[PDB]
Each structure stands twice: as C-alpha cells, then as structure tokens.
Structure 1
Amino acid sequence: DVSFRLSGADPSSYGMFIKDLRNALPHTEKVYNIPLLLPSVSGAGRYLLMHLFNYDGNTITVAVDVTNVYIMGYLALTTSYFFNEPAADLASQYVFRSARRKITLPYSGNYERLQIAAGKPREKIPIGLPALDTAISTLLHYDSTAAAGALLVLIQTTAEAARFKYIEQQIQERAYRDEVPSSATISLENSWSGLSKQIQLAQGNNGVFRTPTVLVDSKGNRVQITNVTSNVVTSNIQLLLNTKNI
C-alpha cells in the first residue's frame, strides 16, 4: 500500500508519496528508460491501495489498477464506492469486500463523464494540496455530484502526478494555495495514452514517433512532439501505458 497525510504535508512529503506511488506499480522493463506498465495482472495483485488522510486525519482508501493507474473505487467509512463500468465492477470482486455496503457511483471514471456529472470542466476546478484535502473530505459522505468534482481533483493529484513529473511539480507549487491546472497539464493528461504508444512505437523506428503528438507547452503554445529527444520523453513522463492496452 501507499499512504499520504495532508496534516503537515508540504512539497517534500507529497514528492515522497508520488515516488512511493510510482514505485508500487510493477514493471518488468523500461522503454527509453521509462517504466513500462504491465499488459495485465490477474487477481488482487492488480490493485494498489492508497491510504489518504485529510487534515483532521479521516481516511479513505483508494483502489488503483496498476496496469493503467486508473482509479477504480474507494472505501470511505464502512461503505465502498465503485465507478459504473466493467473494470470497476471487476475490481469490486477483489477489493473492499469487508465493506458493509457497496455503492456504484452513477457514472464511469473518465474525464468526460466526470466533468458532466460535476457540471464543469476541469479547466475550472482548482487543484493542489488544499483541494486534495477537500476532496478526501467530500468522499467521506456520499453526494454523487460533489464526489465527481472531488474525483477530478483526486485523479489529477495522484495518478496524473505519478505519470508526469511536470504535474507533480504543479501540485507542489499548489501546496498551500489551489489553482486551476495549466493547459499544459490538461494536455499531458489527455495525451498519456498517445505518448505512451508513440514512445513504444519509436523502438524499432530509430527513436522517431510514427504519429506526432500535439501538446500545449508551459507558455501556452501548441507544439508537436516527434521523437524521443523531446523533454516530455527524457524528463517528464514517468510511466508508460503498455500498447497492449491501446
């Protein structure tokens, strides 16, 4: 398992949690020195538990699929909550079975569906450590509309930060003050799958992507990533989704 406490949290302790989260995801190889997530894992070993504690020390446990860093559901108090989708239903056979009741959330876990449920795009939702503390608190008591917004914060502050060092740094910059994500952040989130794929197709193609990936950079400009020498590849991305899942 991995753990993070908001009480006394700072950029360093958050860094340590995102490092622990990355190190808990298994891989048998690296592609251009980046961990390649596994094609598949069966049984309960598919799911990592993240224990998150709000500032008052209340806790939820979040279940993460180690092959794609997808949040499947979470346990709050004695009740479990799972996204409305077959992968989460499968997760519910393995994790949080000791819960006294199981609620299926009235949406699947992907950004588009969560934004609909929440009534707003994530361009308009501040993120940071304070927002993460709020999110954890929200998820302690069922409210599906509020939970959708909280899950957008949770996904971005945990999974997406694990995937990209840039997003980890963004959250670190938002340790004591929330701010809406940069367009670069949004872009990286939306391109993880594409980048993961192109980095893998690059091996066998002399480090050149078969199809370029269009990103927004720190300054707000659209740039085209064409090969593995780009900083997105050499410094930023920390985990690759296996092309077997693309």
Structure 2
Amino acid sequence: DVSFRLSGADPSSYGMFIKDLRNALPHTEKVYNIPLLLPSVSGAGRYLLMHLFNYDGNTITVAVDVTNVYIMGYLALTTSYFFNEPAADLASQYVFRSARRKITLPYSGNYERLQIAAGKPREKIPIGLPALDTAISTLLHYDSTAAAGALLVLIQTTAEAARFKYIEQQIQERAYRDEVPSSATISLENSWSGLSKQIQLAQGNNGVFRTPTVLVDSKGNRVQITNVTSNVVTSNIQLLLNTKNI
C-alpha cells in the first residue's frame, strides 16, 4: 500500500508519496526508459490501496487499478464507494469487502462524467495540497455532487502526478495555495493514452511516432510531439499505459 498525510505535508513529502505511488505499480519492461504498465493482473493484486489522511488525521483508502492508474473507489470509515462502471464493479469483488455498506456512485470515473456531476470543468477547479485535504474531507461523508469535484481533485493530485513529472511539480508549486491546473496539465492528462501508445509504436519505427500528439506547452502554445527525443518523453512522462489496453 502507499500512504500520504496532509498534516505537516510539504513539497518534499508529497514528492515522496508520488515516488512511492509510481514504485508500487508493477512493470516488467521499460520502453524508452519509461516503465510500461502490465497488460493485466489477476485477482486482488490488480488493486493498489492508497491511504490518504486529511490534516485532522481522518482517512480514506483509495483503490487504484495498477494496469492503468484508474481509481475504482474508496473506503471511508465503514462505507465503500465505487464508480458506476464495470471495472469498478469488478474491483468491488476484491477490495473493501469488509465495509458494512457499499454505495455505487451515480457516475462513472471518467473526466467528462465527473465534470457533468460536479457542474464544472476541471479548468475551473483549483488543485493543490489544500484542495486535496478538502477532497479527502468531502469524501468522508457521502454527497454525490460534492464528491464529483473532490474526485476530480483526487485523480489529478495522485494518478495524474504519478504519470507526469510536470503535474507532480505543478502540485508541489501548489503546496500551500491552490490554483486551477495549467492548460499544459489538462493537455497531458487528456493525452496520456495517446502518448503511451505512440511511445510504444516508436519502438519499431526508429523512435518516430506513427501519429503526432498535439500538446499545449507551459506558455499556452499548442505544439506537435513527433518522436521520442521530445522533452515530454525524455523528462516528463513516468508510466506508460500498455497498448493492449488502448
């Protein structure tokens, strides 16, 4: 399992957590020196448990599918909660079975559905360490509309930061002040599957993407990534979604 405490958190302890989160995901091969997540994992070992503690020391445990860093659901005291989608129903066969009750949230875990539930796109929702403290708190007691925004903050400050060193750094810059994500951050989130696939297709194509990926850079400028020499590939991305899942 991995753990993160908001009480006393700072950039260093958050970076320790994101390192532990990346290290908890199994991989047998690296592609262009980036860990390649597994095609599949059977049974309970598919799910990583992340123990998150708010500033007061209250906790939720979040289950994450290790093949794709997707959060499936979470446990808060004696209640489990899962997205309304078959992968999360499957996960509920393995994790948090000791909960006294299981609630299926009234949306799936994808960004489009969560933003509809929350009433706002993630361009407008601040993220940071304080926002993560608020999100954990929100999730302690059921409120499906509030939970959708909390889950948009939780997914970006845990999974997305694990996938991309740029997003990890964005959250560290927001350790004591939330701020909406940069458009670069949104672009990377939306591009993770495409980048993961193109980096894998470049292995028998001399390092060249079969199809360019368009990203927004740190200045708001839209840019084409065409091969593995780009800084997105050599520096930023940390985990590849296996093409078997794309």
Common fold: TM-score over 0.5? yes
2:181 maps to 181
Measure the CA separation in 2 of the matches of 1:211 and 1:28: 26
Partner SS state of residue 108, structure 1: coil
Measure the CA separation in 2 of the matches of 1:113 and 1:39: 25
TM-score by length of 2: 1.00
How far off is 1:79 after superposition?
0.2
Measure the CA separation in 2 of the matches of 1:157 and 1:108: 19
How far off is 1:129 after superposition?
0.1
How far off is 1:233 after superposition?
0.1
Measure the CA separation in 1 of the matches of 2:194 and 2:168: 20
Q: Percent identity?
A: 100
Partner SS state of residue 61, structure 2: strand
Partner SS state of residue 146, structure 1: helix
How far off is 1:229 after superposition?
0.1
Query: What CA deviation, in whole Å up to 9, does each residue of 1:110-166 have, x standing for no partner?
Result: 000000000000000000000000000000000000000000000000000000000
5+ residue gaps, structure 1 = none
How far off is 1:238 after superposition?
0.0
Measure the CA separation in 2 of the matches of 1:122 and 1:107: 16
Number of aligned residues: 246
How far off is 1:196 after superposition?
0.0
1:207 maps to 207
2:3 maps to 3
How far off is 1:171 after superposition?
0.1
Partner SS state of residue 103, structure 2: strand
Measure the CA separation in 1 of the matches of 2:35 and 2:129: 26
5+ residue gaps, structure 2 = none
Query: What CA deviation, in whole Å up to 9, does each residue of 1:16-64 have, x standing for no partner?
Result: 0000000000000000000000000000000000000000000000000
Partner SS state of residue 7, structure 1: coil
How far off is 1:185 after superposition?
0.1
How far off is 1:240 after superposition?
0.1
Measure the CA separation in 2 of the matches of 1:28 and 1:38: 7
How far off is 1:77 after superposition?
0.8
Measure the CA separation in 2 of the matches of 1:42 and 1:188: 29
How far off is 1:188 after superposition?
0.1
CA RMSD of superposed structures (Å): 0.1
Measure the CA separation in 1 of the matches of 2:30 and 2:188: 20
Measure the CA separation in 1 of the matches of 2:133 and 2:73: 18
TM-score by length of 1: 1.00
Partner SS state of residue 52, structure 1: strand
Measure the CA separation in 2 of the matches of 1:29 and 1:130: 36
Query: What CA deviation, in whole Å up to 9, does each residue of 1:61-86 have, x standing for no partner?
Result: 00000000000000001000000000
How far off is 1:228 after superposition?
0.1
Measure the CA separation in 1 of the matches of 2:97 and 2:117: 26
Measure the CA separation in 2 of the matches of 1:198 and 1:101: 42
Partner SS state of residue 210, structure 2: strand
How far off is 1:88 after superposition?
0.1
Measure the CA separation in 1 of the matches of 2:178 and 2:79: 29
Measure the CA separation in 2 of the matches of 1:33 and 1:67: 18
